[PDB]
Ligand binder design. Sequence first.
Ligand code: K
Ligand code: K
Ligand code: K
Ligand code: MG
Ligand code: MG
Length: 136
Amino acid sequence: EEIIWESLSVDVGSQGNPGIVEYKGVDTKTGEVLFEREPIPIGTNNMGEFLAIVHGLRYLKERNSRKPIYSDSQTAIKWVKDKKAKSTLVRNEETALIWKLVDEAEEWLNTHTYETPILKWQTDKWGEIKADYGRK
RNA sequence: ACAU
DNA sequence: CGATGT
Ligand SMILES: [K+]
Ligand SMILES: [K+]
Ligand SMILES: [K+]
Ligand SMILES: [Mg+2]
Ligand SMILES: [Mg+2]
């Protein structure tokens, strides 16, 4: 089982969990940063991991790219497969933004098609995913 | 347990 | 040490 270097890698970063959430996508081969989301004041790690994958799907579809996406998040990979982010985060005025983005990401999944393989990055064998924030 |  | 998730 070897790395598919022709791929997009995504990851969340946070200050607190729940806390400030951001995410980015990079070229697995080169580390070039391809997209970065502006920090969201309150969210969870898994909401961010989910948004990162969906953004990657949208990014690759817009560019007519068949590359796979790597994520290190078992949870977010499943939520994308299910088209349903089963987050425990309370809905209130302070979490409204992240929940709106999650709802809109689900809505996109329910209205578009993709063949993009969504692959588990095998951290135990390969080290940290290339999109990691270096904060742990 | 496993993955963040 | 705390948290989010299957
Ligand atoms: K990190
Ligand atoms: K990790
Ligand atoms: K746990
Ligand atoms: Mg991650
Ligand atoms: Mg990371």
